[PDB]
A = this chain, B = another copy of it.
Amino acid sequence: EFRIAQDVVARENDRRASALKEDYEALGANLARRGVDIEAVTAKVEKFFVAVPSWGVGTGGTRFARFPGTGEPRGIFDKLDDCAVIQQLTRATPNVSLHIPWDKADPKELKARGDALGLGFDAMNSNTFSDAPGQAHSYKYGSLSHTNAATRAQAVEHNLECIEIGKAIGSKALTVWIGDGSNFPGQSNFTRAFERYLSAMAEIYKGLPDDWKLFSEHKMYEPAFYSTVVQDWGTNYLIAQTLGPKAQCLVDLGHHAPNTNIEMIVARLIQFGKLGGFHFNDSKYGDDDLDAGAIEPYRLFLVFNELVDAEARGVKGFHPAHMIDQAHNVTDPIESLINSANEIRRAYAQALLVDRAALSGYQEDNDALMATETLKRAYRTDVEPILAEARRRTGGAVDPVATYRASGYRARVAAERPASVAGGGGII
């Protein structure tokens, strides 16, 4: 199937082919003068993939309000149809990340739809940070770390079910992010809550297939506003080290305290073999969940610099799961995910241009200026031509968003799906 007509894609590509050939050739000549083979770079970029969040193709909101657009997806099936568009145009998001119970449905159908749309399934995501209809025990005061045994058992069961769904659809990991924490000093005993959490996670670990991974995701705050059980990478490391070989840490960019050196955390986790994966997005204030690289592109580049460095030195058993975790409140969710996936490949491609030998030399000589300039030479490079050519050669669009708007997809699905209504957030 092709959510976007092939003629429109070919049409929009031909319209930009000339300019692209020029830019690509100019960049290739420049890279050559730098001892770099543009073709080698493009080949790797075509092979870089990042999972899209099923809950990301829908318009998001804040605790104050939600302003849905037209053609909002009704459920997992409409969401998969929209994710297909993203993959077809960018060719960078072949896999979708499911969230339960939001995307609960017959595993056979999900798999079927995915195969038909040319989409796979990444890590499963459990939900014990909200109450579902008919739920026996509320997660108001926590889940996996709740003081009530029955409540923890219920949370554990839910996570085990997520693993069962994932196995049936082709997933190989479970990501566990909970809101568990406290809003007031004294409300929670830090140590006892963590102990409860560890014990519950141990039960979940027991249900992991031999080739599966369990990712725990830390977050400084929100929904808890005083303390959070899994508040940072330090606690997260203790979790992973304690649970076992299959347990690793997931780093969501906007989940750190102000001014935190996030790329260092990535490096530390790689060093001790616990970098399970990433949740890409950008931010300026808190866990803003904005389009990747829209606020601080250099920081995104620096994270990838650590990723490529580890890749370069053959760090064996190094396959971090890459996923986008964003909320789109003022843009067409599909266009944002498209450009976000693009930005990620942009940062990856620039990281690949880093002269590793020269950098190592300046590091050993303590030539700070040249070391930092060596990274900038790669970062300053406009690799858009490589990103565009990679898409073109793999069946994607030179200009993804332009082709998307030219296709009229949004207007189309807007006519097929029921209207939505604005409203307030959880504030009241």
Contact = CB atoms under 8 A, between A and B. Distances in A.
Interface of A: 19, 22-23, 26, 29-30, 33, 55, 58, 60-67, 102, 129-131, 133, 135, 138-141, 147, 179, 182-192, 194-195, 220-223, 225-228, 231-235, 237-238, 256-261, 263-265, 267-268, 270-272, 283-286, 288-291, 294-299, 302, 305-306, 309, 313, 327, 329-332, 335-336, 339, 359-360, 362-366, 368-375, 379-382, 384, 401, 421-428
Given A62-B179, A286-B286, A381-B382, 19 more contacts: A22-B30, A60-B426, A62-B223, A63-B425, A64-B426, A147-B365, A184-B371, A186-B305, A186-B362, A186-B363, A187-B330, A194-B271, A221-B259, A222-B285, A225-B285, A225-B286, A294-B372, A331-B368, A382-B382
A126 to B, nearest CB: 13
A332 B365 CA distance: 14
A26 to B, nearest CB: 4
Contacts of A223: 62, 64-65, 329
8 contacts: A64-B130, A147-B366, A190-B267, A191-B267, A235-B268, A237-B238, A238-B268, A295-B298
Contacts of A259: 220-221, 257-258, 284-285
A284 B225 contact: yes
A134 B103 CA distance: 30
B270 A225 contact: no
Nearest to A329: B183
B61 A138 contact: no
A137 to B, nearest CB: 11
B33 A225 contact: no
Contacts of A129: 64-65
Nearest to A25: B26
Contacts of A257: 256-260
A368 B183 contact: yes
A185 B295 contact: yes
A86 B339 CA distance: 40
A50 B63 CA distance: 25
Given A64-B130, A147-B364, A185 B329 contact: no
A297 B373 CA distance: 13
- State the oligomeric state as a number of copies: 4
Q: By CB atoms of chain B within 10 A, which of A139, A191, A289, A306 has the most?
A: A191
Name the 7 nearest CB pairs between A and B, nearest first: A61-B426, A234-B234, A67-B140, A65-B130, A257-B257, A131-B422, A190-B267
Contacts of A194: 267-268, 271
A296 B187 CA distance: 16
Nearest to A242: B272
A235 to B, nearest CB: 6
A23 to B, nearest CB: 6
Contacts of A339: 369, 373
Contacts of A182: 330, 368
A280 to B, nearest CB: 16
A270 B63 contact: no
Q: By CB atoms of chain B within 10 A, which of A22, A187, A220 has the most?
A: A187
A131 B419 CA distance: 15
A62 B228 CA distance: 15
A286 B62 CA distance: 14
Contacts of A62: 63, 179, 222-223, 426
Contact of A22 (B29, B188, B189, B360): B29
A26 B19 contact: no
B227 A184 contact: no
Contacts of A291: 184, 369, 372
Q: By CB atoms of chain B within 10 A, which of A195, A225, A423 has the most?
A: A225
Contacts of A373: 339, 401
